[PDB]
Amino acid sequence: DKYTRARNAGGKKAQDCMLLAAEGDSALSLLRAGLTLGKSNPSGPSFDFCGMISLGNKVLQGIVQVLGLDFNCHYKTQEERAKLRYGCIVACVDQDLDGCGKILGLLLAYFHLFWPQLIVHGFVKRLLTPLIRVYEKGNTVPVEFYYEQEFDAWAKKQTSLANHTVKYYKGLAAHDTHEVKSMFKHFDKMVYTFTLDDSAKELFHIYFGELRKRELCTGVVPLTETQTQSIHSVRRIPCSLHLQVDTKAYKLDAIERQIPNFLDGMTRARRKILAGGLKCFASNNRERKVFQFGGYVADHMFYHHGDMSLNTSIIKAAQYYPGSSHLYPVFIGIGSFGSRHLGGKDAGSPRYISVQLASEFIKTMFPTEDSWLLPYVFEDGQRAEPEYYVPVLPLAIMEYGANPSEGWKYTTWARQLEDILALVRAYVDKNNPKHELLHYAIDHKITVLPLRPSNYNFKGHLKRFGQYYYSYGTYVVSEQRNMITITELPLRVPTVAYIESIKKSSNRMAFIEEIVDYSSSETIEILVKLKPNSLSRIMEEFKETEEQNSIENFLRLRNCLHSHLNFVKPKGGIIEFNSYYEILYAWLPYRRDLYQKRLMRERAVLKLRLIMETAIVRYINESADLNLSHYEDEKEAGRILSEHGFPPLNQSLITSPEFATIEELNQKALQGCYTYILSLQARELLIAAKTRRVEKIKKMQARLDKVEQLLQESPFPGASVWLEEIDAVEKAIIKGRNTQWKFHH
Amino acid sequence: DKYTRARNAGGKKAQDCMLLAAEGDSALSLLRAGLTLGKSNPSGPSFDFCGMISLGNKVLQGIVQVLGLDFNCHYKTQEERAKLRYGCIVACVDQDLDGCGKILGLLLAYFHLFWPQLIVHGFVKRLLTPLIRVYEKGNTVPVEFYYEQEFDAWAKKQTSLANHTVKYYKGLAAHDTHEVKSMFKHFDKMVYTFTLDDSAKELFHIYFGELRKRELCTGVVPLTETQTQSIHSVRRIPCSLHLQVDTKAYKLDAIERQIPNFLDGMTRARRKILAGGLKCFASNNRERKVFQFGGYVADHMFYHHGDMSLNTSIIKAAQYYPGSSHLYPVFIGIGSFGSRHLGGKDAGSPRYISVQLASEFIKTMFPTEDSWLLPYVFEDGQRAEPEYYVPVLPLAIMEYGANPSEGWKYTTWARQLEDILALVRAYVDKNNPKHELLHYAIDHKITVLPLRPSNYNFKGHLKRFGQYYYSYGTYVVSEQRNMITITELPLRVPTVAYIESIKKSSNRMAFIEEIVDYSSSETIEILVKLKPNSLSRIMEEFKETEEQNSIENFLRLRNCLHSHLNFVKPKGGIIEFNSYYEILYAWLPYRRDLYQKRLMRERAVLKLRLIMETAIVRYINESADLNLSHYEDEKEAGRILSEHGFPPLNQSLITSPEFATIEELNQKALQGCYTYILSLQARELLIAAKTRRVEKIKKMQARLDKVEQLLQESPFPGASVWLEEIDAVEKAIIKGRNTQWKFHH
């Protein structure tokens, strides 16, 4: 049972021997390597007082068998604990959500449910391996932090990290051999005891029992430095904090994987996919195979999940057909990506079909200059997809989406594009008559403009009964041949799935004699021929109200547009909406603020670029008598340029204004060198390049004072820019819809 | 049963009906979209005279049910075939090898086995979609090729492919919607009938029956131009040609996924991984996670298989432990990559463990300047990993490799490194006392130097009896306790697997009280407690005369080293060897020819670089009197440069000597440009830069002279370079062995 027995286990020294419980054969091998250091690690842990077991049901039965525990005792007394085969059980798991949060919480919940006194007496402990290690170059010993807060506080204390390399160890298998030896040299210091708490009694029931959904509404709060210091002083971890942090983070990650945000209506994996598509196709928009693009996404943006899910999600993002999940797909899919039949799972293998970026729609929808201002999530210290995207339009409500969750449901039907455009234009125009009235609605929680479900690719009927919308397909009946030609199915209903649902009910085949599917790749045309004189029996069997018809109910030609508007908050946690209009009003302020954020960032980078380009053109003009050829090396030329009034500038930061904010920009750009003059190509010396430089200089000057003007726009800065972007994105949407979302045609 | 019944199927006009058989739901959807074009494609195929069936036993039973075929009947008469429900069956399969070889080949074999008269009568057909489509820029009508040979011939007929974009359609899902409509417009042309040949009867038994082994001994031969023209003109394809050129290729590719090429001892997947590692860690050797590197390999090296196999193969390449597959791993693995136990399958998760290139070993074992010359595998017109690597030492025999095979068996035990080094040094040195008779033995296929199995990480005994080697583990038995301590297991025997093998035998368990694994990470320490007075029973029961001791036979400590030397020929086909020196002799000429080719190309590149650098330094010395600021643009600047004697040079070619043969750059150096003078930065005009350029010019002139002298070397050109590379490889291997393949740690 993957158990290694210690020599002193079950003997008179049972109170001294420990039982390291690990998840996975890799963790078992690491524990074995650490324990078998032998004389190379004197006084360290070995199999004399340590046994190993694997957590990878019957596993807990084996654990209770080896430990000697019984279900008819509480182990409050000292003698009951002394009767155990081991002094303590130490969980040796990872530091990620799956390992540390899920496995450890499950084990702790099991122990608390069965023998809470063991946790009270600290019988169950954990192995707290270092999480972040900072290695200074020229040094062999690292600086170890067990939490992100300690690492970032230390980094704030530090002045620069150019001489330090930061390594994250989220799993037990990430430790190197010398690192494992270093950890096992001080093995006793890494053991942390678990103590029960008053709040933990209900926390265990919450996280492992309804009200858990209330608990997950708010985001995960990292432990403050005071709690970490208190834990490290005594090496005791209250299980309440572990449940509040690790288990909550694991559950929130699962929710984020299943439930999307409301700012962009799109999940973490999909955000990785879109960001990878933006990065890959920015330089050259060319067709790439689905598996190649998935490999690029996994390599560059830390998509560690299974490649099959990555390819499935890429195909889903590139799918465009009536009833598809995406009304405005971000990828143009060259090949066969499936159709409404089978619900889009009939796509080809990833190695045949190819994808490319919808350059026009993506550029008009997610501005390239706006990606720098978003908050980004960092995977093991490396930049990854943005925490959220803020499109020009509320993308969360203009596309369909269906997803089950752990007690939650995500169901969104796309709203009418015209209504959304009218609402946003009224909000931003300041000239539309309903602008002030829309603001009055926004700050008083009321609705002024309708928001109807979209029916772009739908050829049925959308009827509202009460507060619920229903989609109806279209059919024609020909009793002359005693058969029905279904021409339009209910919205978001797969063809073969509908046919098999019809064939499942034996009641309906009391009259049906044959069903065939002659539908095209886009339209639906299903020939269902019935038994003779079956029309009378269809009439008498099915009574329907004014909402349905006898044929409609007989063919199940009605679909109810249920809406479960549950999304995740931008800063963590989930929020449950009840209307699309409040989602729109919630999305608006982020876009409004990020517009002006981009505005001042553009102003600052424009000033810096203008200064550099003026210096460059001055150097080009004066290069005739400033021949660097007669001069010796780099430093002499830099000193001479300094003596000639040229300013030292960080051209790398300015010509490439990355995610660095305006304070970093104006504190680092002026602190540079003269590489911009020395990096000038010889082709820049001819007067044609100088004319190009000066005309572009006047262009950026015009852009600069126009940005100065726009920063004082009345409704909010950049309102006209928002209007122009709305017009561009609606033109791109119209162009895509005209050409079946196949551009370049 | 995923069958769309045709309107006239099974009727009076059933002879005009066809049954399109599609492999995959994507192919089914493509066929449906093509058929349902309706009025957009007048006089085209439709569901009136065409039905759709899915091929992806039970499906064969469905086909015979729908077609009305009778096993008893032979359909040798016109009326018997007229009784069928469909006129003919068309197999719609991908133009790849899986579909077409596995599917179409199996269908043809089944039909020939059961109803050969249908095949000889033309009842079985297929859909031959275009394989390559080349589009002229600015033209909406492409030009198509159904075979690669005709496309290659057309490319030879062409002059330049700059204005032509080539797309490969290896699968039905790769066709675009407009391409599908264009195909179904002339669908009548794309259907090809199958003809039965008397020689094809033998091939059917060969591929679907022992004769497979000496049928696959040679590589696949592509169809000649005349055969393709005859097939196209009459639209009939013989079964023998299809089996010889298509399903044989599928079988060969399936075998190649298991059996490695003897030139480098790595399969297609491992060669792709090595090429990706060389391409990724070339500029920067920073550690990358396993999943990130797998994504990079999939994106760049065209690894279209699943990510699980890719990660497993990367882990196998990075593993280093006693008994591991790779004695000289390609990648240094930071993290827990596995141990002797679990057969090394206890590696860490791919998202935790990291890999990096063993540059100090790889860069000399596989020279970077030699990868430019290897034949490269092209996937869909895009370059991929080379056909075979030619390492400095024969890697197919210095590392252990075992794998179950289909129709074959592959097992190879590593040879002693000292023996391999001595053999290669004798061959190349020209001064070794064993050089001449080794050359003689190469021609006479005899042995002049010993080649013993390696025992680097093995602490047991390598005993040869008859013609078979045996590995013996070391044990110690203590009678004062009546226990057995296994200190070393036989070569390449997993610890847990060995323990389970011992435990599953009841006779051995009759005497053993218990077994407990106390082994270290790389040291085996297995404790076996025996029942009382058992030693006499072991003495009398498991006694062996001379091959084993009684204890060794009882504990199964002897393992036979069966070497199945069956490798993949570099030009396709399987070649079987009888000894390792045969493999070495076969490998040597490839390395010698590669060295000669490298010398030739290096001399050419050095001449070109000398010319270019002389021009650059002449321009730099003459830059003060020739200022480009006064000049207008690049065209007249280049005109002035030509007037001043500067030659136009293709800078992108000389600076980056990519995968081009000597003739390629010899003919492309005639074309030139003046970008080399124009694109040099201002910092290059300094005196220090000019002096460095002059020193580099002198050094490269000396290197050119050295290469010219080396080209006339006596044993063969580059013998001294080969010896130096051998010494460097030996030093790198020794250094890695000292540091447990953890260079710089």
Author numbering:
A (entry chain B), B (entry chain A): 416 to 471, 502 to 654, 658 to 1193
Give excerpts from the publication.
The African swine fever virus (ASFV) type II topoisomerase (Topo II), pP1192R, is the only known Topo II expressed by mammalian viruses and is essential for ASFV replication in the host cytoplasm. In ASFV, a functional viral Topo II pP1192R has been identified, encoded by a viral gene conserved in ASFV strains, P1192R. pP1192R is detectable at an intermediate to late stage of ASFV infection, mainly within the cytoplasmic virus factory, and has been confirmed to be important for ASFV replication. Topo IIAs exhibit a 2-fold symmetry and comprise two functional domains: an ATPase domain and a DNA binding/cleavage domain. The mechanism of enzymatic action involves the opening and closing of three gate-like dimeric interfaces, which are called the N-, DNA- and C-gate, respectively, upon ATP binding and hydrolysis and DNA cleavage that introduces a double-strand break in the DNA (G-segment) trapped in the DNA-gate for transport of another DNA strand (T-segment).
To capture the intact structure of full-length pP1192R, the protein sample was then analyzed by single-particle cryo-EM. After collecting and processing 2134 cryo-EM images, two types of particles, referred to as State 1 and State 2, were identified and reconstructed to the overall resolution of 2.77 and 2.98 Å with 131 161 and 78 195 particles, respectively. The electron density was only observable for the DNA binding/cleavage domain in both states, while the electron density of the N-terminal ATPase domain was absent. Following the process of atomic model building based on the EM density map, the apo structure of the pP1192R DNA binding/cleavage domain was well resolved in both states, with the C-terminus of the protein (C-gate) adopting distinct conformations, accordingly described as ‘open’ (State 1) and ‘closed’ (State 2). These apo structures can be traced for 779 residues, ranging from D416 to H1192, except for the region containing residues G471-N501. In the closed state, an extra dimeric interface, the C-gate, was formed by the interaction between the coiled-coil helices of two protomers, which retains a distance of ∼16 Å in the open state. No significant conformational changes were observed in the DNA-binding groove when comparing the two apo states, while the coiled-coil helices underwent a distinct conformational rearrangement, presenting the dynamic cycling of the C-gate between open to closed. The coiled-coil regions (from A' α14 to A' α18) of each protomer move towards one another in the closed state, with the furthest end moving a distance of ∼13.4 Å and a reorientation of ∼12° relative to the open state. Comparison of the m-AMSA-poisoned DNA-binding/cleavage domain with the apo structure (the C-gate closed state) revealed relative conformational reorientations of the DNA-contacting region of the two protomers.
